[PDB]
Design a protein around this ligand. Structure first.
Ligand SMILES: [Mg+2]
Ligand SMILES: [Mg+2]
Ligand SMILES: [Mg+2]
Ligand SMILES: [Mg+2]
Ligand SMILES: [Mg+2]
Ligand SMILES: [Mg+2]
Ligand SMILES: [Mg+2]
Ligand SMILES: [Mg+2]
Ligand SMILES: [Mg+2]
Ligand SMILES: [Mg+2]
Ligand SMILES: [Mg+2]
Ligand SMILES: [Mg+2]
Ligand SMILES: [Mg+2]
Ligand SMILES: [Mg+2]
Ligand SMILES: [Mg+2]
Ligand SMILES: [Mg+2]
Ligand SMILES: [Mg+2]
Ligand SMILES: [Mg+2]
Ligand SMILES: [Mg+2]
Ligand SMILES: [Mg+2]
Ligand SMILES: [Mg+2]
Lengths: 53, 53, 187, 53, 147, 125, 52
RNA sequence: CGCGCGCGCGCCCGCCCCCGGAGCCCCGCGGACGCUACGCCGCGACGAGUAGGAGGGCCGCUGCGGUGA
RNA sequence: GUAAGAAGCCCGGCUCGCUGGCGUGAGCCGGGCGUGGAAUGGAGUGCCUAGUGGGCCACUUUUGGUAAGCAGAACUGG
RNA sequence: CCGACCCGUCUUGAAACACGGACCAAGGAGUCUAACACGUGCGCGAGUCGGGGGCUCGCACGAAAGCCGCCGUGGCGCAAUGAAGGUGAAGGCCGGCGCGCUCGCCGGCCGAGGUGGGAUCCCGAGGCCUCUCCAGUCCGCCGAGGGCGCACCACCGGCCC
RNA sequence: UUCAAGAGGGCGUGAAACCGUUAAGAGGUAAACGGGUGGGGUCCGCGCAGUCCGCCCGGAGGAUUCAACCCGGCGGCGGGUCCGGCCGUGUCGGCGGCCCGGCGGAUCUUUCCCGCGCGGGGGACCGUCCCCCGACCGGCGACCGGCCGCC
């Protein structure tokens, strides 16, 4: 990364677009978790209309 | 720059000797199958031998 | 029956990047979560631009960045881009910057780091500021291309400063009936 | 006079060569490609330079 | 790739995508660019104006090497030289005023598009423009001609 | 990394099976044998696997050693245990829970084990 | 028969261009013949420079 | 605004462990039997079709490269 | 066919080879004042682009013709 | 029991007293190159391309693969305009020498101009729940109002031939 | 004779149209067709009961090891008062390899020379790859010997 080839006359390696791929390790950090809303796991379904009259 | 650990040599009956080599920065380059598939399928044509009628 | 129309009941936006670049897709996994689980719109915008195509992600030049961040109030604040940073050799005095992007050219990389600057990625961004606080979205000239000169009203018309499609540029290839009063007319 | 052959830009071909070497480590990928490998002592496998003779 | 085409999708479909009232017949308008004055007058007055006629003088045996003048502006001038130069100038205060040949780096005429930072540079070139000559003396430099 | 290994290995792999609208995977140490991120032995820095004894009595347990990776010869630990099927499950349950070794695989292990022990008897008289 | 706003083009195919097509399939052998000739000359003129 | 407002336990004063598990429908310690995220789940509205335009095809035919110990 | 308000109203000051009893007009600056009839629903903008370019009927109006399952038109719907 | 006229095709209109068709198996009909326009995908980036040739493999693969003071001779691009000769893209603010004359000469500062709309970002009175009073530091969010204003659009203005 | 002539001299397999025979069924609005049921035959599976299976608790019967708890060895997980040491990065401190190591320079010395305005090695100078100790973030998923608890 620091120097270059010396046998190819100009070739430095490809650069990374995304350093840390440890995705689970990221999303479980405290920094992000503090910056979140609450989830919502409760589930709502087709209620059946009954007749009041 | 990322980590570059120590690789160990194995003599010609196994028998890990005391030689050690830190690996190169090639084995930390990014891995992209789409570019491999493209370069393969496109270079595997250049060995063809024509046909016709 | 129901008298309505179905010609305009599908919308023609993106839903995902059309490519298989896998590093892209992990970024997309991330920002969906943040857009889904946060009360912000910075997250929304970025998610929308990672789907975009490449003519919808033109390159930003080191020149514009400096002009847009030397403006008052934008001191100490991060610059954020969803494309590439090039170099502009028409600029000598490169100050301290804190840029974030996907790609960065090589000559541009060196100068930025030699002024004491810093270069980030979207991963290390979301660890420093999940919600976009202290940032500046920027964008390149989406109509910089030479394609947009041929568009609009047609040539062969009045008040149309539109470029035509011609093989070669010379003396014999236009510049006659249609463009001189002395030969036909002139729109 | 069909068009049998293809040209491909040099920088791409060099990239891919770098990529294949990387995944030559990472045991999981070797396993998946079907190589019975579960007894070698180290995966970037290296030996003395005597075996050239 | 034949398998990604739309001839692999018009099997069963009787006409292969070209109608029933009108058909894919051979050459039904002409053959080529025929009809700029007759029955294609409108495409060529509209989208290609300047096509029919004649204009200008004639130069019979024209050699494009006589007429050759590569151009450059002022902004893209300090890049012909390295960075040792521009920094070691404005330093040691002798009246350094370096020298810049354009004919070395493949350029003949100089043009005054942009601006440039304050150092008293010297320039050597075959041709100049009026504004370019001004800007240089304005910064405290000079201009020099060569053959 | 894990996702990186995964985004290559979704669709293209020698241990992959795709017929009859079903999709299975045969890599060693895959509980439930399905093509998944949660269930795959070759991807994680921590994995557990369960097999039958070769002699033909008991269960073989397999755990990864976490310290030296990239040298697969000595990355796996093995034990074979042969008891009365209530001690055997309880022993497993104690490994995982009390060491926190990938604890989202608990009951999957147990079901695989019981299946084996049920088979590893005179299923016929 | 033209259509909406393209180029005007003039291709040179109104002759019989098709008896007279030329393949560059002998490109490598042409290279290989030369080396063996280029080597052998320099062996004929033994110490003298090979270039000329 | 009376399904808590200061309830309980030792001796007002203090304790005020408490889910490595309270006690029944919110547990801010971690997880779905669901998590092939190119996945799983939920709601609500719609479905005519020639010429023609697009998409999905684990529908198919012949051969090349790898792979199914 | 127009109109039914923020692209509006008001206050004060600047520039002008334009026009000139003195003045008008237009443009620039800086301040003060938000619902402006009904009932409905997500709007806008840009590229590439196929097949078509023989028509037919009915109420009503309607031209030639003795009339027509005749010839030629306007409106809407098929 | 009820329903139900033979397929293809031309046509305003076909069950037709409009053409084709006894029956079966096999073949059979939207291609390849050259050039252009746009859309998508990849790589490098004011630069980018070795396609011609040469250095290394005898060529089992492989007529492949790698490499080059060729490393850019050159092509496309970075600058337009005119029949041509030929010319050739930024300003202001302040102070000194002539009369702000819709005008010429000595010294500093900024600098690709402005108006309107404008995703996001910034500051922020008073706080939303705090078993009581007051003190009250970390954190969301509000929200009065107020600013820096990306691309892009409409207009004004300026520079080159 | 041959495994095979259900391979017999134009003899690998051996389709369809079209024919001969046998078995069943039917028959005055040419035949054929779609939806809905019925009847009959040919075959599959009953079983010649199909009473389906699995957890815990209770009961009566017999039976042989272990575990409960202790001790010994072996292996592994985790830890941080960062116990001691490595290693790795990121700039810094030491210019410390810069000549004790090289690459480049449209910077000078043309302070020199080499053959005489010059082509090259020297001498500075600038950058760029590397040596000795100190630090911390990112000690991070870069490895040991420790001590401790648990399995
Ligand atoms: Mg419809
Ligand atoms: Mg539509
Ligand atoms: Mg159709
Ligand atoms: Mg078509
Ligand atoms: Mg047809
Ligand atoms: Mg027609
Ligand atoms: Mg076109
Ligand atoms: Mg439909
Ligand atoms: Mg059309
Ligand atoms: Mg029709
Ligand atoms: Mg007719
Ligand atoms: Mg018909
Ligand atoms: Mg008839
Ligand atoms: Mg006919
Ligand atoms: Mg006939
Ligand atoms: Mg056939
Ligand atoms: Mg393109
Ligand atoms: Mg036989
Ligand atoms: Mg036979
Ligand atoms: Mg036969
Ligand atoms: Mg028969």
């Amino acid at each position: 990364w620091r120097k270059a080839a010396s046998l190819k006359s100009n070739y430095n390696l490809p650069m990374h677009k995304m350093l840390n791929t440890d995705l689970s390790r990221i999303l479980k950090s405290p920094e992000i978790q503090r910056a979140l809303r609450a989830p919502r796991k409760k589930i709502h379904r087709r209620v059946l209309k009954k007749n009041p009259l | 720059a990322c980590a570059r650990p120590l690789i160990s040599v194995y003599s010609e009956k196994g028998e890990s000797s005391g030689k050690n080599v830190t690996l190169p920065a090639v084995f930390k380059a990014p891995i992209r199958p789409d570019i491999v598939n493209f370069v393969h399928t496109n270079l595997r044509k250049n060995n063809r031998q024509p046909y016709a009628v | 029956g129901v008298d309505i129309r179905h010609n305009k009941d599908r919308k023609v936006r993106r839903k995902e990047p059309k490519s298989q670049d896998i590093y892209l897709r992990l970024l997309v996994k991330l920002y969906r979560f943040l857009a889904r689980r946060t009360n912000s719109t910075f997250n929304q915008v970025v998610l929308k631009r990672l789907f975009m195509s490449r003519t919808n992600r033109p390159p930003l030049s080191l020149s514009r960045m400096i002009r847009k961040m030397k403006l008052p109030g934008r001191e100490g604040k991060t610059a954020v881009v969803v494309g590439t940073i090039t170099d502009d050799v028409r600029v000598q005095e490169v100050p301290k910057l804190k840029v974030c992007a996907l790609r960065v050219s090589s000559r541009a990389r060196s100068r930025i780091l030699k002024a004491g600057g810093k270069i980030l990625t979207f991963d290390q961004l979301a660890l420093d500021s999940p919600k976009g606080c202290g940032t500046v979205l920027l964008s390149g000239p989406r109509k910089g291309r030479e394609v947009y000169r041929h568009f609009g009203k047609a040539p062969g018309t009045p008040h149309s400063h539109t470029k035509p499609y011609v093989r070669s540029k010379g003396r014999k290839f236009e510049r006659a009936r249609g463009r001189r009063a002395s030969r036909g007319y002139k729109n | 006079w069909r068009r049998w052959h293809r040209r491909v830009n040099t920088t791409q071909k060099r990239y891919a060569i770098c990529s294949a070497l990387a995944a030559s480590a990472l045991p999981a990928l070797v396993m998946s490609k079907g190589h019975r490998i579960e007894e070698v002592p180290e995966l970037p496998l290296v030996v003395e330079d005597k075996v050239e003779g | 790739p034949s398998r990604l085409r739309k001839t692999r999708k018009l099997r069963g479909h009787v006409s292969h995508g070209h109608g029933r009232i009108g058909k894919h017949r051979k050459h039904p308008g002409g053959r080529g660019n025929a009809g700029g004055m007759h029955h294609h007058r409108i495409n060529f007055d509209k989208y290609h104006p300047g096509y029919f006629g004649k204009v200008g003088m004639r130069h019979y045996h024209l050699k494009r090497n006589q007429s050759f003048c590569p151009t450059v502006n002022l902004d893209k001038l300090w890049t012909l030289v390295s960075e040792q130069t521009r920094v070691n100038a404005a330093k040691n205060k002798t009246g350094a005023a370096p020298i810049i040949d354009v004919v070395r780096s493949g350029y003949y005429k100089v043009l005054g598009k942009g601006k440039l930072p304050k150092q008293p540079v010297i320039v050597k070139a075959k041709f100049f423009s009026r504004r370019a000559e001004e800007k240089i003396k304005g910064v405290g430099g000079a201009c020099v001609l060569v053959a | 990394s894990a996702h990186l290994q995964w985004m290559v290995v979704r669709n293209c792999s020698s241990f992959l099976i795709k017929r009859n609208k079903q999709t299975y995977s045969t890599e060693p140490n895959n509980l439930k044998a399905r093509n998944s991120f949660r269930y795959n032995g070759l991807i994680h820095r921590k994995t557990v696997g369960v097999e039958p004894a070769a002699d033909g009595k008991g269960v073989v347990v397999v755990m990864k050693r976490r310290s030296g990776q990239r040298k697969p010869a000595t990355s796996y630990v093995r034990t074979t245990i042969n008891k009365n099927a209530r001690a055997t499950l309880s022993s497993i349950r104690h490994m995982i829970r009390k060491n926190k070794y990938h604890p989202d695989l608990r009951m999957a292990a147990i079901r695989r084990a019981s299946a084996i022990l049920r088979s590893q008897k005179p299923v016929m008289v | 028969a033209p259509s909406r706003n393209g180029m005007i083009l003039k291709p040179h195919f109104h002759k019989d261009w098709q008896r007279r097509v030329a393949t560059w399939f002998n490109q490598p052998a042409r290279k290989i013949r030369r080396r063996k000739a280029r080597q052998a000359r320099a062996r004929r003129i033994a110490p003298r420079p090979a270039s000329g």
